[PDB]
Amino acid sequence: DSIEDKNARVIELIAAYRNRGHLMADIDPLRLDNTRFDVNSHGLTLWDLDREFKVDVQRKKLRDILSVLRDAYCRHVGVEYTHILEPEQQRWIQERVETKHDKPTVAEQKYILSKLNAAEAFETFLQTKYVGQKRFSLEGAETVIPMMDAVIDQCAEHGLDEVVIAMPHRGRLNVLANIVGKPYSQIFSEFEDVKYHLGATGTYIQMFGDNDIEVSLTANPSHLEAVDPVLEGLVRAKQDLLDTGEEGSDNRFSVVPLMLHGDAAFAGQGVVAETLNLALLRGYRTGGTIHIVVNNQIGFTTAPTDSRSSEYCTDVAKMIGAPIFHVNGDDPEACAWVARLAVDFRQAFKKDVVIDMLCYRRRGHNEGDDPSMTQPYMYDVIDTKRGSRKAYTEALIGRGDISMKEAEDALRDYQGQLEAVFNEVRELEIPSKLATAVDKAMLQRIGDAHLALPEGFTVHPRVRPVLEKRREMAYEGRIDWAFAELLALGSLIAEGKLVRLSGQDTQRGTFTQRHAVIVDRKTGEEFTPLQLLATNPDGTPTGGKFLVYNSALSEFAAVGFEYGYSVGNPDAMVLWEAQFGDFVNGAQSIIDEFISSGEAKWGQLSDVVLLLPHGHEGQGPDHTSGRIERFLQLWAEGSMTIAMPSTPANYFHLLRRHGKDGIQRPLIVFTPKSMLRNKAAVSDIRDFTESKFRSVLEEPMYTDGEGDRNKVTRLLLTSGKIYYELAARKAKENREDVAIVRIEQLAPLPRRRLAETLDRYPNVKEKFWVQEEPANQGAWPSFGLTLPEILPDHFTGLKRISRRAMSAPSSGSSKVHAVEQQEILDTAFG
Amino acid sequence: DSIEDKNARVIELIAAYRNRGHLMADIDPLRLDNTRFDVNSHGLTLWDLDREFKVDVQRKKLRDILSVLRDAYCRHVGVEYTHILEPEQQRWIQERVETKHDKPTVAEQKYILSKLNAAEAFETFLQTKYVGQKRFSLEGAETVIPMMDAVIDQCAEHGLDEVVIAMPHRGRLNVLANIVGKPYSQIFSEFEDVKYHLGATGTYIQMFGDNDIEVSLTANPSHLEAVDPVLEGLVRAKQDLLDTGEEGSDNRFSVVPLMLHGDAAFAGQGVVAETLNLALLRGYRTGGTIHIVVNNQIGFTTAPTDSRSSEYCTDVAKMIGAPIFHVNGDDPEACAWVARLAVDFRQAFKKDVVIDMLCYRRRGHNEGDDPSMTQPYMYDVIDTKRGSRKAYTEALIGRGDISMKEAEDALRDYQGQLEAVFNEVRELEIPSKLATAVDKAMLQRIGDAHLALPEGFTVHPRVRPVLEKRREMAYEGRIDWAFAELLALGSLIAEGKLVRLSGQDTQRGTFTQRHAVIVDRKTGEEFTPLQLLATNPDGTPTGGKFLVYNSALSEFAAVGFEYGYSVGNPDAMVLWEAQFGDFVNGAQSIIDEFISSGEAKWGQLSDVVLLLPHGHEGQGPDHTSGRIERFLQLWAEGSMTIAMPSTPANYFHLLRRHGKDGIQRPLIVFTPKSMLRNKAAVSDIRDFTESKFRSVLEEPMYTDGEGDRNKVTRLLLTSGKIYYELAARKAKENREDVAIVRIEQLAPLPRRRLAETLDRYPNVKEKFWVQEEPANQGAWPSFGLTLPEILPDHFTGLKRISRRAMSAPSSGSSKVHAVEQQEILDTAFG
Amino acid sequence: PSGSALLVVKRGPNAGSRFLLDQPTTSAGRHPDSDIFLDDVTVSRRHAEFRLEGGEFQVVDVGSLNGTYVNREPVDSAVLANGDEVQIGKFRLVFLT
Amino acid sequence: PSGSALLVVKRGPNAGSRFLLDQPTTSAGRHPDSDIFLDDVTVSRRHAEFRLEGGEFQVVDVGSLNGTYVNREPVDSAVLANGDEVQIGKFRLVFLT
Numbered sequence A, B: 001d002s003i004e005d006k007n008a009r010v011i012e013l014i015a016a017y018r019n020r021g022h023l024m025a026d027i028d029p030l031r032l033d034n035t036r037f038d039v040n041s042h043g044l045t046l047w048d049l050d051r052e053f054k055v056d057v058q059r060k061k062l063r064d065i066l067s068v069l070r071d072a073y074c075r076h077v078g079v080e081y082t083h084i085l086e087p088e089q090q091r092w093i094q095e096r097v098e099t100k101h102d103k104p105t106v107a108e109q110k111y112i113l114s115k116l117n118a119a120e121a122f123e124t125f126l127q128t129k130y131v132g133q134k135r136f137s138l139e140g141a142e143t144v145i146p147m148m149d150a151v152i153d154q155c156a157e158h159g160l161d162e163v164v165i166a167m168p169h170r171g172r173l174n175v176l177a178n179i180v181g182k183p184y185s186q187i188f189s190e191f192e193d194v195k196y197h198l199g200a201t202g203t204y205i206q207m208f209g210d211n212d213i214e215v216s217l218t219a220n221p222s223h224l225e226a227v228d229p230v231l232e233g234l235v236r237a238k239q240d241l242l243d244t245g246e247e248g249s250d251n252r253f254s255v256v257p258l259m260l261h262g263d264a265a266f267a268g269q270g271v272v273a274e275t276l277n278l279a280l281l282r283g284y285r286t287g288g289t290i291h292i293v294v295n296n297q298i299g300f301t302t303a304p305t306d307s308r309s310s311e312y313c314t315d316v317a318k319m320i321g322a323p324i325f326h327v328n329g330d331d332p333e334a335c336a337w338v339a340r341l342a343v344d345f346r347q348a349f350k351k352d353v354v355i356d357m358l359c360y361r362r363r364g365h366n367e368g369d370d371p372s373m374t375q376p377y378m379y380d381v382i383d384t385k386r387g388s389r390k391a392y393t394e395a396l397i398g399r400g401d402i403s404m405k406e407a408e409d410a411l412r413d414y415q416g417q418l419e420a421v422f423n424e425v426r427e428l429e430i431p432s433k434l435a436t437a438v439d440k441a442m443l444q445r446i447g448d449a450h451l452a453l454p455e456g457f458t459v460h461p462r463v464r465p466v467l468e469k470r471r472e473m474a475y476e477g478r479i480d481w482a483f484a485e486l487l488a489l490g491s492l493i494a495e496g497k498l499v500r501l502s503g504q505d506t507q508r509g510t511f512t513q514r515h516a517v518i519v520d521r522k523t524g525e526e527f528t529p530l531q532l533l534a535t536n537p538d539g540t541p542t543g544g545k546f547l548v549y550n551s552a553l554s555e556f557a558a559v560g561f562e563y564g565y566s567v568g569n570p571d572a573m574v575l576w577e578a579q580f581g582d583f584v585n586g587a588q589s590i591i592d593e594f595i596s597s598g599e600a601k602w603g604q605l606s607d608v609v610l611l612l613p614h615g616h617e618g619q620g621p622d623h624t625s626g627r628i629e630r631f632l633q634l635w636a637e638g639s640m641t642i643a644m645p646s647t648p649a650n651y652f653h654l655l656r657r658h659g660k661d662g663i664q665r666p667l668i669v670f671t672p673k674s675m676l677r678n679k680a681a682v683s684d685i686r687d688f689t690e691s692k693f694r695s696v697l698e699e700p701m702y703t704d705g706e707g708d709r710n711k712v713t714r715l716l717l718t719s720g721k722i723y724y725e726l727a728a729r730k731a732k733e734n735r736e737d738v739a740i741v742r743i744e745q746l747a748p749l750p751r752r753r754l755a756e757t758l759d760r761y762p763n764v765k766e767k768f769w770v771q772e773e774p775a776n777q778g779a780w781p782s783f784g785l786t787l788p789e790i791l792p793d794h795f796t797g798l799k800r801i802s803r804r805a806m807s808a809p810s811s812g813s814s815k816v817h818a819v820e821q822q823e824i825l826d827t828a829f830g
Numbered sequence C, D: 001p002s003g004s005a006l007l008v009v010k011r012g013p014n015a016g017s018r019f020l021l022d023q024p025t026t027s028a029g030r031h032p033d034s035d036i037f038l039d040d041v042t043v044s045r046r047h048a049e050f051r052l053e054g055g056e057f058q059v060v061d062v063g064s065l066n067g068t069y070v071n072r073e074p075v076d077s078a079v080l081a082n083g084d085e086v087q088i089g090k091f092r093l094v095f096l097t
């Protein structure tokens, strides 16, 4: 055949290596697949090895092309990059992977060996000194320590400010000692642990460089990968604070997320896809995450063939076009080199890089597990494997890189590392009294900001009346719920606070009520009225900012991210909004594992606000309830604040108190839908200037009007929008004998204010808890049990008025809903 | 430059089209990106157009190569396939996409037009006849109807048995009328809806073929993508029933999943990745899913740039190497052609295919939404777009495919379709009394099955005593919890029932207690002892089967799949097992939206069992509680059965009753960890042969021994493993005045049996509910409120003994745990 | 009966249904006032006609979108014979005489 | 004082710490019995020695894994001058005389 035919085959052989060489790469330290390892023979023969072929524009022999291709793609590094859509990114990897690599210096090699000495000495101590540390063993994966070191060092070489780590339990205390740099006295203070879940901060100092970098580790539950979006939010909050990245003056993103994973969890957990989906979003990007999968090719007892449907545990990363590097855990030099390349890619393209470190799990999953019961072949191979430290020491002698004296020096150092940890451990034998009210000038300034439009801006004809009605409300009163929320956030911004608000369609609002961002009818340009309050009338900044975004169609990653954002900046006002509260159950792992329990478990505090649209309106069981009963079940003294305000102003004070109380505590708010446009659910200017947050509320006839509380014999305790309906029935039926009291703050129950209020009704003979929600839902399951115990002289005999107990939050029929609703109001007045 | 240089460039130009041509393809019907659309000029010029180049082995001109490449990859179909690792699959797509395509016959074109007529007539009726149908409008996406039709038709052409559809709300009633084939009388029986969530079955008849195929649609919540694993489990259960696929005699997988999606939800929801991860697993594969994304390039008000971090909404499909086809919604012929190719790929390779149908959303997201408020550019373009039916009719006339008479015939047909739906709607003005006990021969047969090993099988030395101890237990008694579970499942198999058991490390058991599958120490071969009970002593099949698998590291997709599997086969015993009950919250959307509420909401029944390892042992807040209180909160009369058995035999009867009661109701079981190896938590042979399920239990001293119930003054009501500890304290402290009663069935509360039991204690002066769980957790929140109401003569004055209320399921310290536990036992006897 | 013909639905949602051909013209379509009302989106409002002139029965397409078929062959008009199959939309009818 | 030297930690976890050089041999390492105890995994059990013979101060590597550096240059042994920087593991010490 022609030289033209042979050339064609070489161009295709070059493409075959770049695309699929990773499949032939020697990445498995155990060499378990005997059928893993000729592509060359496809019209090309031994005769063509010395024939020259054109290459990008030099002319090289086939053997020279093959040696470069084999070294680059078929040794201890499996490169996946031809799936990347950006040609610049493919060319960048191709250039650094296909160049002739200069081997590490003896100094660098000795430094890697000192980190393997430290990693293995730490593990030996752990297994020896304490019982039940098998589940946390990094044995067979110690190369992750010089690899993490190389990541952090490379970040310090770029002059970045911090590396924040998220990881599961395997090798955590090893990471704390050898990466984070925590002393042994702190690591093993009182060992029984909770130490496998706590956060930590330290300073990394470069060995050959001039820079330092902050290194921190975040707190996490046992729930594998749940921390992934939490880390991202935490890093973004830090980036915003340092004026770096998306919301900063530089494009450096100088706070780096380093996310560690297990191979079974990285493939099976959906939050991984959800977090990767945040990587390039304006409201969630962190300039790219460095991911490390400690791929020990097992999940407790489960083989990769039962854990994933793809060649690699990292194939989910192809979702966002991230480059993936599969690296042999027995080659610490290739592991460190890939780590540095990854940081350089993240710096050049502000996008995620995935490192798949192939290794093994030397022990069973936990103390009292013979892993050969379920995987005999794997553990017969592992039982003959020499340790990575001794193998690397053996390699350096073999290659003549280090002398026999130097090997003895390295062995002396190891014993000194072991003696170091054994010796040190042996020797180890308020609320702020601030006013939430604002002046009339503040309310006016926020209303005027809605009309202070940019030059030549065109407002949509349907959005213009909203802007004008807000200037009217600000000066005249009759302020609705949607305006009161912006009055609260805008006035915090004016006071210098960072306010971050986000969720699905949050910019406009699900119910077309917010309009926090307005779109230019002719150019699509955005305008944020509250961003004007970040500047004082004299032009100087307040220090405040309005960061408002539309989220992705996620709950788990979005709620996790917002929780992490509040941990990353305790001074920020962070609010996440559900489309409807009914969808927040998709983020249950975050509510359970982080928001409701993080403080008691880890001492980690969060001031995150969750806005959950709630209310029975006939819109179905997936558009009715934020599951009040579940949040109330999770609650414990000082856990969270749980509220359901009935008034725009009482919600204003609720938010303002939350952002100014100097306490870090999550706030759960059951927000309205149709009550947003209820003409009665409106507030006076005075309610914003001359009042505070009211945890309990009475009818305005008893506080402002001419209402006689002594004629009252039946008292209806309620929360939410049903008050207005009960009150309307009271007005039409002219009933003086009945009064309605609203519990605005559900948790903590306001015992004192509730008592004081009921004492103003001396002739009450029957008390009733009124709710829209079924008997097994709403506030009744908890209130029914706690109210007669907490206040026995006020709630012993407290009966229930509600929808009947159901297996769903509501009926599916809006006609049934209308019938059930009239029944409650008829019983309340029966 | 040389012809060698020019050849090299052509080989690379060919690779550039196959790899990246999809980026230049005319896939957007709105043409919103003005910068979307020369690659040719890279050393190649106008002069080289007529130069011949070698191709796979013919010689073609550059213009001939370019025309094929442009037709195949740059017209109305964007093909993504070069990311697929299997070369056979890449070659299969390349051959069918790069061939010269024969245009449809006039008959086929007229048939597509009749389906657009039906799709548009249906939509026109919907918007006209009823108010508030804007949120469900398929307007701008009607091409999905001939596309779905082509999918189903192609499945019928392969002679398959059924197509099962899962989809969100958009165009559902249109799918029901024009795809599922339900009549208008059923579709609009009583319109107010719940009709957007119900299941349906119909028969599809081919228009040009000889075959019929069953078409069904599954029920789903408003939670987008939650139904994805449910559909997969439902299809797998159907496949297993038809003896097709993974657990069948043929490799046909003749039940096809057709999964529809929205573009924002497909990119943001983590369950999508989790379900794609099931696609090739032994225990979860369905032979490949056909996915359709109705890509209207908007998510309520959110633009794709805020919803995803990748070029396409379908990039998550690259995770499992699925081919992706981006297709212009304005080209119904290309839409139908891609649909048929997809079914052929799924048949050839038993793997998922993703179809990204690019379209638009003609209206706002709901009635009273001006979508130009948030997207003015998109809706200024949409407002000028002609409908797909009229555009296709205009195309066929233009191309001369149909005559003017034929166009009038098509317009006459449309009016007849509109009149058809307007006229039809106008004219529309028990438990089985079965014994759960087995004979001694059955118990012996199951014990003997553990030792009836295959010829030349080598058992692991640590697994051999387990096998021998089970033969001993079967003949001698002292049966532990792990054996009683297998006694229950094995005896159901012997009776002919299909038993499917799965979860993380379920084959062996998390606590090395199950050993349902045993591994050959020398060859890795698997042996399933209970699979021997599928055959009678005479060799004839029983009709029973043991399907036991290790799941992926998923909860959402695994629990969803098992729920769907129980809906797909009501006769199967389906059990999902959590590693620890604490991880089931990752599947909260499935528990809330399907398991606990599917029957009340949709009339859809499930008999799924959830095994949730539960118990306070000092192992942390993520290894202690399955959140009993949350399941009890969700419960309503006839919703679910909730149990926490304390005895191996009482658990045996619980499972046997569940599988033989002839009732489809989910079963939630709080299963043990350390109580599995408790020497006291053992049962007699007689408890399995001469007894039934006991919802309430007394101490064996009062039922078998010489216990005097009249000396009892204090009664301790409990559930779970804490009984043994209380009983041990009673034995050591020799206390006759105290008795312990166990509530084995938590829901439904057994009022009658509980009453009967307490009546046998006439001298009781103080009752106490004893639990390990904090005051706000366990059974107390519900029992504390319901027990004095349900039985006022028995539980008025019932006090609580437990751990204090906490924000987490437990303390992190095992020392605190040990102190708190001794405190409860000390208070119980204080 | 002699001279009169029969149509039997063999494939379609109303399989087993029978229509007697005893008139000069017998309309087949989706219009509810059709002599043979074949209810499906594939059948046009006015689809076909079964005509009896002299002794022979004829099927005639009267402007349907999906056409009329006789023994899998598209026709504008066709003489029918005992055992012939007529396709009107997704329906397959068997002609007996 | 005259004849005696000083070591000041400028880079390391104990930055600001000072060690007086007033002996014939002054050991530097991770052994807790070291004259200059530099606590880090990068410093060997027995790392360096500061030797005073005659008038000149010398730094000597005594078999460490990561070596000893004087003004960013690796050494086996080196004479020290006022203002020189010694690197022992991640620690950077400033020599004053």
Ligand SMILES: Cc1ncc(C[n+]2c([C@@H](O)CCC(=O)O)sc(CCOP(=O)(O)OP(=O)(O)O)c2C)c(N)n1
Binding pocket: A135, A170, A222, A223, A224, A225, A261, A262, A263, A264, A265, A266, A294, A296, A298, A299, A300, A361, A365, A366, B504, B553, B579, B583, B586
């Ligand atoms: C979300 C959720 N769901 C399930 C689990 C359970 N769970 C764990 C413990 O919690 C339990 C057992 C133990 O005692 O150690 S460890 C584990 C296997 C992890 O496999 P991997 O990712 O490959 O990592 P590796 O261990 O480094 O090889 C599972 C599946 C969980 N933690 N979180």
Ligand SMILES: Cc1ncc(C[n+]2c([C@@H](O)CCC(=O)O)sc(CCOP(=O)(O)OP(=O)(O)O)c2C)c(N)n1
Binding pocket: A504, A553, A579, A583, A586, B135, B170, B222, B223, B224, B225, B261, B262, B263, B264, B265, B266, B294, B296, B298, B299, B300, B361, B365, B366
């Ligand atoms: C899991 C979860 N989380 C959030 C939602 C909320 N939610 C919906 C309603 O439920 C609410 C609003 C409405 O009134 O219609 S519709 C919607 C947007 C869907 O975007 P898409 O996927 O591109 O589809 P398309 O609509 O065809 O363009 C969202 C985000 C949900 N349903 N489930």
Ligand SMILES: [Ca+2]
Binding pocket: A607, A657, A658, A659, A660, A661, A662, A663, A664, A665
């Ligand atoms: Ca606060």
Ligand SMILES: [Ca+2]
Binding pocket: B607, B657, B658, B659, B660, B661, B662, B663, B664, B665
């Ligand atoms: Ca049952």
Ligand SMILES: [Mg+2]
Binding pocket: A262, A263, A264, A294, A295, A296, A297, A298, A299, A300
């Ligand atoms: Mg693993």
Ligand SMILES: [Mg+2]
Binding pocket: B262, B263, B264, B294, B295, B296, B297, B298, B299, B300
């Ligand atoms: Mg959409």
